[PDB]
Amino acid sequence: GLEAKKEENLADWYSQVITKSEMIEYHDISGCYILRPWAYAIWEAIKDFFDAEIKKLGVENCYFPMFVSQSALEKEKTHVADFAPEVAWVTRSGKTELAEPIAIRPTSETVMYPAYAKWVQSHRDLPIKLNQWCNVVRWEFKHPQPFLRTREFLWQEGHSAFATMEEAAEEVLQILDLYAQVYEELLAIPVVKGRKTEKEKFAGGDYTTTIEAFISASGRAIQGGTSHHLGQNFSKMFEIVFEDPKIPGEKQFAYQNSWGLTTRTIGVMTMVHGDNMGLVLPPRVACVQVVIIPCGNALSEEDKEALIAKCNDYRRRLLSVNIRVRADLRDNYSPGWKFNHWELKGVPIRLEVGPRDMKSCQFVAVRRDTGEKLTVAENEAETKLQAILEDIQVTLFTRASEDLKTHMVVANTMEDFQKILDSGKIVQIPFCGEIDCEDWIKKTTARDQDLEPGAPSMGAKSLCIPFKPLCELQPGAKCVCGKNPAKYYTLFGRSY
Amino acid sequence: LEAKKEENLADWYSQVITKSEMIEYHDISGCYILRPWAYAIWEAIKDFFDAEIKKLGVENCYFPMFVSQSALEKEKTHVADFAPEVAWVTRSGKTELAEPIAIRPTSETVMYPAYAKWVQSHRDLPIKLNQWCNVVRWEFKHPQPFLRTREFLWQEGHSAFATMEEAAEEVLQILDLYAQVYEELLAIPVVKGRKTEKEKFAGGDYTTTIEAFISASGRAIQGGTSHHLGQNFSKMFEIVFEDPKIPGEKQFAYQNSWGLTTRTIGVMTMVHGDNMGLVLPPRVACVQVVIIPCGALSEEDKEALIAKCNDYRRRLLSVNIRVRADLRDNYSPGWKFNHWELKGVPIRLEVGPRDMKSCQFVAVRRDTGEKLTVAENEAETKLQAILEDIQVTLFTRASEDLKTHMVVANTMEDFQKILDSGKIVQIPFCGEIDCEDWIKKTTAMGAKSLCIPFKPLCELQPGAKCVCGKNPAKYYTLFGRSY
Ligand SMILES: O=C(NCc1ccccc1Cl)c1nccnc1NCc1ccccc1Cl
Ligand SMILES: O=C(NCc1ccccc1Cl)c1nccnc1NCc1ccccc1Cl
Numbered sequence A: 001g002l003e004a005k006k007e008e009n010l011a012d013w014y015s016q017v018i019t020k021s022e023m024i025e026y027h028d029i030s031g032c033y034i035l036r037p038w039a040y041a042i043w044e045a046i047k048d049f050f051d052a053e054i055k056k057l058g059v060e061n062c063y064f065p066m067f068v069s070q071s072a073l074e075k076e077k078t079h080v081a082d083f084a085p086e087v088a089w090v091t092r093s094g095k096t097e098l099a100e101p102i103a104i105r106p107t108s109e110t111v112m113y114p115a116y117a118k119w120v121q122s123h124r125d126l127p128i129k130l131n132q133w134c135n136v137v138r139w140e141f142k143h144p145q146p147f148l149r150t151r152e153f154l155w156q157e158g159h160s161a162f163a164t165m166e167e168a169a170e171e172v173l174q175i176l177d178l179y180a181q182v183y184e185e186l187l188a189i190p191v192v193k194g195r196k197t198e199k200e201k202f203a204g205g206d207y208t209t210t211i212e213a214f215i216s217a218s219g220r221a222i223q224g225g226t227s228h229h230l231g232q233n234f235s236k237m238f239e240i241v242f243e244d245p246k247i248p249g250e251k252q253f254a255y256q257n258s259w260g261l262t263t264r265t266i267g268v269m270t271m272v273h274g275d276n277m278g279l280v281l282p283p284r285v286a287c288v289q290v291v292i293i294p295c296g297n298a299l300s301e302e303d304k305e306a307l308i309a310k311c312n313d314y315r316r317r318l319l320s321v322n323i324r325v326r327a328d329l330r331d332n333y334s335p336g337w338k339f340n341h342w343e344l345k346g347v348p349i350r351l352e353v354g355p356r357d358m359k360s361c362q363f364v365a366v367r368r369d370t371g372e373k374l375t376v377a378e379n380e381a382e383t384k385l386q387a388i389l390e391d392i393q394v395t396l397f398t399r400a401s402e403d404l405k406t407h408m409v410v411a412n413t414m415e416d417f418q419k420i421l422d423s424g425k426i427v428q429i430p431f432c433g434e435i436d437c438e439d440w441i442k443k444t445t446a447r448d449q450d451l452e453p454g455a456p457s458m459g460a461k462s463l464c465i466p467f468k469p470l471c472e473l474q475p476g477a478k479c480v481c482g483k484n485p486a487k488y489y490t491l492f493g494r495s496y
Numbered sequence B: 001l002e003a004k005k006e007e008n009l010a011d012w013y014s015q016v017i018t019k020s021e022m023i024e025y026h027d028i029s030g031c032y033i034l035r036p037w038a039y040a041i042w043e044a045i046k047d048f049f050d051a052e053i054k055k056l057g058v059e060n061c062y063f064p065m066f067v068s069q070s071a072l073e074k075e076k077t078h079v080a081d082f083a084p085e086v087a088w089v090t091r092s093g094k095t096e097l098a099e100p101i102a103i104r105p106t107s108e109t110v111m112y113p114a115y116a117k118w119v120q121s122h123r124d125l126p127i128k129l130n131q132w133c134n135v136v137r138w139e140f141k142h143p144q145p146f147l148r149t150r151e152f153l154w155q156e157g158h159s160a161f162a163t164m165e166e167a168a169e170e171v172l173q174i175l176d177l178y179a180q181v182y183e184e185l186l187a188i189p190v191v192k193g194r195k196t197e198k199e200k201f202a203g204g205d206y207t208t209t210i211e212a213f214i215s216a217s218g219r220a221i222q223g224g225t226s227h228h229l230g231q232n233f234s235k236m237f238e239i240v241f242e243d244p245k246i247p248g249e250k251q252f253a254y255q256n257s258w259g260l261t262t263r264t265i266g267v268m269t270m271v272h273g274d275n276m277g278l279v280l281p282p283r284v285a286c287v288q289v290v291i292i293p294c295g296a297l298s299e300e301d302k303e304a305l306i307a308k309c310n311d312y313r314r315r316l317l318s319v320n321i322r323v324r325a326d327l328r329d330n331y332s333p334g335w336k337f338n339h340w341e342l343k344g345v346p347i348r349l350e351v352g353p354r355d356m357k358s359c360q361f362v363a364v365r366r367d368t369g370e371k372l373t374v375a376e377n378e379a380e381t382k383l384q385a386i387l388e389d390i391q392v393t394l395f396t397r398a399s400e401d402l403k404t405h406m407v408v409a410n411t412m413e414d415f416q417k418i419l420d421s422g423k424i425v426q427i428p429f430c431g432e433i434d435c436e437d438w439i440k441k442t443t444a445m446g447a448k449s450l451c452i453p454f455k456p457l458c459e460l461q462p463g464a465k466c467v468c469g470k471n472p473a474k475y476y477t478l479f480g481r482s483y
């Protein structure tokens, strides 16, 4: 069973659902967490979808070394300046020291692009579309939260290089739309497509696109993924040059993109869909979609091998119709134990089979998201359970998206922007775009915060500039700072 | 290809891995880039091995890469052999950590503390976990791509059982899977054997392994290991369960561990690769067949055989034949031939205006080079039979080189004559550690102990002593200089 309440102490609710669903085990190194098979299967389900899609775009999988030299890491000046204090350095091999300290990748820009330069000698070498599934290390000192904020995490990073800027800009939106599919269609989480501000953009690129999700339990938003257009800032430092047949002599630099998505996906899935009973898995990423457990001392041993065979009969039928099913035929656990054990893990459907239900050619089907039981005939298991599982996926998303539509509004002044901020909601406001003004928003929001006992206050930072804002910017509408005119509607709010 | 294998295979190796677009070099010694052509071979190995172990009940996971210093030295024998190879993190940016952090050379010390918490009763075992990850063993010896790298990819399965023969059963069936990976997939016959006290995994009781042989180098190479750790780790990591019968009798858990690294790709190139580029076995071939148009180019008729090109591709993918249509108009067909030859695609399909109207095409094997013309109606049947022929020929040819280069030696004079000829030898051994260090210096290169084969070449009669002449021989051990 679960003890902590989600509506009150969300932090303790989160630490108990990730451990009692057997997803996360803690490690003696702070910030590093063990991804148990239950959580890792979700990442592999995300991997199977995203891998099959980038290959359609012409992207191939590879693996680059995790260690970066000093000179290679410092070629891009501003890119290394943002990641510098967050880089873990290897300075000794056992007892003997290293002649040159090597760095662990916080990202593989400075690792791949020296190789991109050698691979690009003419126009026939482009485009290059490479992706890798690996781990990276960012030793940020902020308080770590499993899945969401970890010193080491798993991700994919795709790095593409084009001779054209139109080809590169086209890929940025293509990948970001795939990221939205990962959250909306696999995790049943609505996201807001948008562009990062100049303060929050990827240091070293021209612009950064992103998807932002909302967690109503804490009133905080979180970035689900990013797709950057690096322009030529890396091609001009790493000399990824080529000769154009139309214009010769002038050394042309390649246009590059970089896009990443991490295991944070699993943490957002926990915060959005989880309840006070435990985890709640979307059926499209659930390791097992339907769990089968026999229900119901003096019973003869002949009929004991009969109902477990119907369980194996159900398990085998669902596998032919492509439904991930587990048969919990373990006898050392009580039926009530495995009841809470599997809804703590969040399996979308629990299949119950009592002795009387078996003889009556029927079985019970309990839903995880709502708890509704349904006595189903034994000839309806393949077509109806598939219809129930798909109904789980849509209601989790329609509830989460109705939860987001309610919690995302518009405000045109600090009085409204701050008031609705204390309402545990995010809000799009007219923004001038200046960086120092964005610091002023994050300052006067934590300064004038109307909080409640139990919830700390943090300044509202920028999240994204939505491609499709709620309402259009009025002609001549000034920014909320008053000292500068507004350039666009910008989504703000407290963030993870 | 430029260099030659028989002459300088070390430069032939560097030539074939880069021209095949498998390996790219990095400004940090020992670290190499796995380009898509090399990574696909590792994925083919991964898809097979992950599917075979899932039948055994082991689940995939991912454990942290950073191991604390208290957890590292909690097993004194394990840290004794790995400490000089452990790369240590000491600073975050420029703020130095109060306690240094170690990168995993293996995950025994990372996982087993968590095993102790997951084992509270008898119902918690067996625990079977595996992870696909990178690993770092910072060694200052001569690096060589795939074979000897400071960083490499692998899988590592860590199982914990209640009885010893439950763990003993898994050690042999995982080792048999590693044999399938090398023989059934990579067409590399190996010898199943056991380790010596000096060579066994520091922290275990006995170590099983498969050893491969590289003919053009005369040196053997460890292809994989499946250890039986016993109760050594569980006693120092308190992974225990209560005795079900007698009360208060705390019992240590029996553990295993097994690994398989990207060295598989390097042994594949060292064994099968010739002097015309790479040679890929069709089972692990990313691109099995490749179709290239050939052959006053009538644009209307030119649009007719490129459709005949895509016709074969649509026919072959229906029979699960992996094929890419190399129809790039910015490169000559002769360039495409040498491009896919250096990559080692097993079969290459050619179609010109003459044979397209003749309803036929030629298919040349990568291993042999036989340009055999075949009919159009009998394509999928023939192309499949030739792909299987490549897999079995490369297998029988590599085993012919194995049996020829795997000989038996009784005394010390014959052992040194056949070892310096570029072959491995099975010598009588007393099992002592210092005798293995002596035979290493008698012929020094220097020969190291490879494996104690489960199936020796010849039986040992009671009476023959070891090569040192002092102690009797308990078993005949395969020896030779390693990598
Ligand atoms: O940011 C992260 N780790 C920094 C950190 C380290 C220690 C303590 C606090 C923190 Cl925040 C992070 N951690 C785990 C998962 N995802 C993460 N980032 C999201 C992300 C990154 C890059 C591209 C796309 C995305 Cl979506
Ligand atoms: O050991 C290796 N690299 C150490 C090293 C680093 C620098 C210089 C020299 C050396 Cl030897 C190694 N490198 C690449 C591939 N596999 C490797 N190990 C084989 C192995 C290990 C564990 C279980 C099974 C196997 Cl098969």
Ligand code: PRO
Pocket: A106, A107, A108, A109, A156, A157, A158, A202, A226, A228, A258, A259, A260, A261
């Ligand atoms: O870290 C980032 O944000 C980009 C995207 C993946 C690679 N680098």
Ligand code: PRO
Pocket: B105, B106, B107, B108, B155, B156, B157, B201, B225, B227, B257, B258, B259, B260
């Ligand atoms: O390093 C080794 O050889 C064993 C096998 C994988 C885990 N530890």
Ligand SMILES: [Sr+2]
Pocket: A058, A059, A060, A129
């Ligand atoms: Sr491509």
Ligand SMILES: [Sr+2]
Pocket: A081, A082, A083
């Ligand atoms: Sr920073």
Ligand SMILES: [Sr+2]
Pocket: A206, A207
């Ligand atoms: Sr710009």
Ligand SMILES: [Sr+2]
Pocket: B080, B081, B082, B084
């Ligand atoms: Sr050592």
Ligand SMILES: [Zn+2]
Pocket: A431, A432, A433, A434, A437, A479, A480, A481, A482, A484
């Ligand atoms: Zn402003």
Ligand SMILES: [Zn+2]
Pocket: B429, B430, B431, B432, B435, B466, B467, B468, B469, B470, B471
């Ligand atoms: Zn001896």
